[PDB]
Each structure stands twice: as C-alpha cells, then as structure tokens.
PDB file of C-alpha atoms in Angstrom:
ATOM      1  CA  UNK A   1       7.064  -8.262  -4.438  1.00 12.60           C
ATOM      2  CA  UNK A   2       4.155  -6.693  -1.633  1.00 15.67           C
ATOM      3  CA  UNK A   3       2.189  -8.217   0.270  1.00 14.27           C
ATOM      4  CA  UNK A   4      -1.449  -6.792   1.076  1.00 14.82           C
ATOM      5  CA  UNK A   5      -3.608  -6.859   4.119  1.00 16.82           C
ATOM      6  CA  UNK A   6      -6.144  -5.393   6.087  1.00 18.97           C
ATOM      7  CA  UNK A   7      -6.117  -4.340   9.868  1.00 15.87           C
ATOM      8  CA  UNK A   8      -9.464  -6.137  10.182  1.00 18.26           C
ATOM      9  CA  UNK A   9     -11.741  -8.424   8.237  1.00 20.90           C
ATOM     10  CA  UNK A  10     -13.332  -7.448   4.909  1.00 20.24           C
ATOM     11  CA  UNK A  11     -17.040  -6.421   6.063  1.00 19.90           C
ATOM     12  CA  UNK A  12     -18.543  -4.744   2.630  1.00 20.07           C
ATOM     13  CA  UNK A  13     -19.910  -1.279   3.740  1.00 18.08           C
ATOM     14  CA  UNK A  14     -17.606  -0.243   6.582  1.00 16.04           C
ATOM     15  CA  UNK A  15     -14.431   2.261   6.314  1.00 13.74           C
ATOM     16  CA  UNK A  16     -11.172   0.723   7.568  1.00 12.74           C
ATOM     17  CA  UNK A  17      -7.260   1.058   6.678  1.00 14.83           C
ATOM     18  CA  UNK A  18      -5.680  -0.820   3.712  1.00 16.54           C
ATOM     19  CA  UNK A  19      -2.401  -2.451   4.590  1.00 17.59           C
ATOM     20  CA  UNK A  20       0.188  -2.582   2.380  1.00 18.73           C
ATOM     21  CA  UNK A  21       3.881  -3.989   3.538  1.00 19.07           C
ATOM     22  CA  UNK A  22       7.066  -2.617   1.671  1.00 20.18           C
ATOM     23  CA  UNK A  23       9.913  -4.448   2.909  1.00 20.69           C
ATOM     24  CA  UNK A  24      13.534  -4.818   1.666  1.00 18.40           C
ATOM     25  CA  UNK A  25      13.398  -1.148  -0.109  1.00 15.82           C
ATOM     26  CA  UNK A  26      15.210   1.736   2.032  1.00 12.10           C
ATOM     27  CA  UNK A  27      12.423   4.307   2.401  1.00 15.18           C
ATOM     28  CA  UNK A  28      14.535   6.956   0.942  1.00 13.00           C
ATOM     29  CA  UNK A  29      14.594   6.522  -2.785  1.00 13.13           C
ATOM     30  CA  UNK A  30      11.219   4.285  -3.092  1.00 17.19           C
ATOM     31  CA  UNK A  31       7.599   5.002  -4.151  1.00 16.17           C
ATOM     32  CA  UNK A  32       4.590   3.547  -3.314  1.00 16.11           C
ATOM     33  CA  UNK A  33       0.912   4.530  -3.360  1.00 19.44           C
ATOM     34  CA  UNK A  34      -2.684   3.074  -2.255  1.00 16.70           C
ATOM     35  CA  UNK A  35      -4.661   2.254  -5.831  1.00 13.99           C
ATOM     36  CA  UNK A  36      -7.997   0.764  -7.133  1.00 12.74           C
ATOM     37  CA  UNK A  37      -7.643  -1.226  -9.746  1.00 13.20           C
ATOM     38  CA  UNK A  38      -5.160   0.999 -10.944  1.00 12.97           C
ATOM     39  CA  UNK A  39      -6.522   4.129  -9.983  1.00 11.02           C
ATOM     40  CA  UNK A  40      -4.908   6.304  -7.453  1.00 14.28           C
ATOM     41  CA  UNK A  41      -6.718   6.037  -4.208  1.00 14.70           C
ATOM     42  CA  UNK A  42      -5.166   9.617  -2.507  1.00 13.73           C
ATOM     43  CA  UNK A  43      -6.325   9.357   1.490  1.00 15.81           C
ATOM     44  CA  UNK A  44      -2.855   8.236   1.746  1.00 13.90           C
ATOM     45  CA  UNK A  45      -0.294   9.487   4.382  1.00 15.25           C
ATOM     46  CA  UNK A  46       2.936   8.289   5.295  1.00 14.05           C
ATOM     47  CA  UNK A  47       5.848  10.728   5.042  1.00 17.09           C
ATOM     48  CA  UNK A  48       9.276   9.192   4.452  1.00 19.35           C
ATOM     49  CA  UNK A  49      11.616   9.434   6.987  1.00 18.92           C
ATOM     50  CA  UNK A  50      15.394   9.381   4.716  1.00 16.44           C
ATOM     51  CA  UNK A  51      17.319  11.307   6.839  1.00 16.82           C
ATOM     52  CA  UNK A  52      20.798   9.999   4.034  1.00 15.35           C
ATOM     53  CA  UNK A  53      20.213   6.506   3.229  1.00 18.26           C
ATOM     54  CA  UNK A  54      17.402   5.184   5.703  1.00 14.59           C
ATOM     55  CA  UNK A  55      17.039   1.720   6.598  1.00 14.08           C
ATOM     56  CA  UNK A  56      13.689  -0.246   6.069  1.00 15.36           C
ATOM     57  CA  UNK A  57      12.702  -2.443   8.691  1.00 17.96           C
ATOM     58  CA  UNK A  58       8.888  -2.054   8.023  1.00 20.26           C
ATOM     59  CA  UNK A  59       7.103   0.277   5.116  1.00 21.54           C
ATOM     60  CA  UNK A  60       3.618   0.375   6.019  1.00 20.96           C
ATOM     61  CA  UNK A  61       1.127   3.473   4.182  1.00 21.66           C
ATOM     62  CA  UNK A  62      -2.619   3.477   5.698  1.00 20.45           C
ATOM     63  CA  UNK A  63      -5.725   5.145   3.267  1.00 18.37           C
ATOM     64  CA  UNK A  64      -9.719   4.558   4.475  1.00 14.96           C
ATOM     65  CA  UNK A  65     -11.163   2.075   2.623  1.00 16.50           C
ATOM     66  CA  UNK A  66     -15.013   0.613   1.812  1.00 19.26           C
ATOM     67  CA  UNK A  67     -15.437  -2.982   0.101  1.00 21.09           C
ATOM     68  CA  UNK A  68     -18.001  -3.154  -1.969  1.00 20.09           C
ATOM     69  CA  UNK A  69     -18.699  -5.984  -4.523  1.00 22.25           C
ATOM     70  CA  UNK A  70     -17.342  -3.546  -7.515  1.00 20.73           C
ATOM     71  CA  UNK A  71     -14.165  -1.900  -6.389  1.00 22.60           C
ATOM     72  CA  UNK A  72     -10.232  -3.905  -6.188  1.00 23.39           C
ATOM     73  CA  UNK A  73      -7.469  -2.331  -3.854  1.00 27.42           C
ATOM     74  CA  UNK A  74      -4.037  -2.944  -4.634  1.00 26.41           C
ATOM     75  CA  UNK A  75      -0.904  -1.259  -3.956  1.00 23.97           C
ATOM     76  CA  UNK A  76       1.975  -0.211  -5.990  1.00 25.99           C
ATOM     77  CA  UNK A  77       5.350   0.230  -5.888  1.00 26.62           C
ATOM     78  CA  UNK A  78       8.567   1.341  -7.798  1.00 25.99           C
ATOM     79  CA  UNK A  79      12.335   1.700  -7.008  1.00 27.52           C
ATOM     80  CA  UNK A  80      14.776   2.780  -8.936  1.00 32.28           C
ATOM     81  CA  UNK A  81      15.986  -0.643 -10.489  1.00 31.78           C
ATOM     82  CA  UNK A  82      12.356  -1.543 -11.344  1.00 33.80           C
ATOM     83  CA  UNK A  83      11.250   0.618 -15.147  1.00 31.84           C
ATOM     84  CA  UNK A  84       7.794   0.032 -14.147  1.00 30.24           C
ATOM     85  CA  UNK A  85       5.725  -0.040 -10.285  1.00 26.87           C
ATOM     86  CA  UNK A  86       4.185  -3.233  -9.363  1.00 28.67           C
ATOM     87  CA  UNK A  87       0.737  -3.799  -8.376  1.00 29.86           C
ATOM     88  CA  UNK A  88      -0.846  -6.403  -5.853  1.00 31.02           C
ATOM     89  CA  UNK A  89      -4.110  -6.783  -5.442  1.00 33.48           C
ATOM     90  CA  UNK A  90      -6.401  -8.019  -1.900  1.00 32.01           C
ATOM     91  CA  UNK A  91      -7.542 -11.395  -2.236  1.00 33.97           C
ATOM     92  CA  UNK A  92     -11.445 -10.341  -2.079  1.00 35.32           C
ATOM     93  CA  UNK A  93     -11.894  -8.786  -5.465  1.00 35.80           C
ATOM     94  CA  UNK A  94      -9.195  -9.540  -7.840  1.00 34.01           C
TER      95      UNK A  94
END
C-alpha cells in the first residue's frame, strides 16, 4: 500500500515535513495527496515529472505539518486500477 514517515521525530507543537513513500506506481498516471483524517491538507508540492511513461524509483510529496494531540495525517493515493484512493495513517494518532 504506503508507507508513512516523518523526516524527524514527532515533537507536538513544532512544524516539520510529512513523509509519504509511493513506490511501484509510475509517476505519470498516479495521484496522491497529504490529508488529515481525511481532509485535504493543501501545503503540498511535488510536480510530476511524466515526460511518456516515467519510471518510479521513489515518490516522495512534502506538506508542513504540527502534531497536536487532536489532528491524524495520512496520505492517499489512487491509480488507475484502484476505484477508490487509499489512506494510511502515522502511527501517533490513528
């Protein structure tokens, strides 16, 4: 599926990047965005890079992120063959 992480450990209060790895899905004709418990973060930038086919050797999206003891991060993504996006969820919340 996706496999979450963070750049550095979870310290509730301070702004940091959410890490979410995409791997196996050629960039080209995927989607995947940085949520909260289902709710579309949207500091999110990573442009795709297709060119024709592309080639994924390492999908990685970065958004600024604060813990707090209320709000779950997850990230979600959809290809083609899926009918609905998949969510995971940091272990620190969920």
């Amino acid at each position: 599926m996706i496999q979450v992480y963070s750049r550095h450990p979870a310290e509730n209060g301070k702004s940091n990047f959410l890490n979410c790895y995409v791997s196996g899905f050629h960039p080209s004709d995927i989607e995947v965005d940085l949520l909260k418990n289902g709710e579309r973060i949207e500091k999110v930038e990573h442009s795709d890079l297709s060119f024709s086919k592309d080639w994924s050797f390492y999908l990685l999206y970065y958004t600024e992120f604060t813990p707090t003891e209320k709000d779950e991060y997850a990230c979600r993504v959809n290809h083609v063959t899926l009918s609905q996006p998949k969510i995971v969820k940091w272990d620190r919340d969920m």
